[PDB]
Design a protein around this ligand. Structure first.
Ligand SMILES: *[C@@H]1O[C@H](CO)[C@@H](O[C@@H]2O[C@H](CO[C@H]3O[C@H](CO)[C@@H](O)[C@H](O)[C@@H]3O)[C@@H](O)[C@H](O)[C@H]2NC(C)=O)[C@H](O)[C@H]1NC(C)=O
Ligand SMILES: *[C@@H]1O[C@H](CO)[C@@H](O[C@@H]2O[C@H](CO[C@H]3O[C@H](CO)[C@@H](O)[C@H](O)[C@@H]3O)[C@@H](O)[C@H](O)[C@H]2NC(C)=O)[C@H](O)[C@H]1NC(C)=O
Lengths: 71, 71
């Protein structure tokens, strides 16, 4: 008897997990868009910004950035 | 005589208890085999709900959900 009862449980669970995985594949798609939100416009500048005789060299990066995203 | 009447009682009782276990196996089927599920549709969102420098961070989660079951 046991084998048929087990197969029935695993059939129905198979349908449920397969549908959930298909829905997840459709559900990913909106996240892909955000990978393109930024673009950098023109040349930026680097400037030596550290104080005289300081242990660390520290530069200053100025760039135009454009954010086309919603965040 | 005795051995044959006892063999017959155990044949009859065997039929009875075997059929009882077969009917029980058919009686399991509805409980183990409910089809349909919570389906999650598209992307959801997480939003910071935390306010006023509270000790525990709380997040809103909003998502579209479809119950295809009967409960
Ligand atoms: C950013 O500015 C610093 C000063 O504000 C400067 O430190 C001085 O460095 C000079 C000599 O610079 C040469 O040698 C160093 C190594 O010692 C190189 O890293 C550098 O590229 C040059 O070839 C030194 O005489 C002086 O005492 C330092 N301090 C001051 C107050 O002048 C950094 O060198 C400078 N970095 C860059 C990349 O320009
Ligand atoms: C997460 O969902 C909550 C409902 O489950 C929701 O509560 C409702 O809040 C609105 C007003 O929310 C505004 O103001 C809060 C600050 O108080 C902001 O965090 C929020 O972004 C909105 O600008 C209220 O009218 C309504 O009655 C509340 N309903 C319930 C059931 O509590 C939260 O606002 C929501 N959180 C965020 C961050 O959206």
């Amino acid at each position: 008897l046991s084998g048929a009862i087990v197969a029935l449980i695993l059939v129905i669970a198979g349908v449920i997990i397969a549908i959930a995985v298909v829905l997840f594949a459709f559900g990913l798609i909106p996240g892909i868009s955000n990978q393109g939100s930024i673009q950098v416009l023109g040349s930026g500048t680097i400037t030596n910004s550290t104080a005289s005789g300081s242990s660390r060299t520290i530069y200053n990066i100025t760039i135009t950035v454009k954010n086309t995203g919603t965040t």
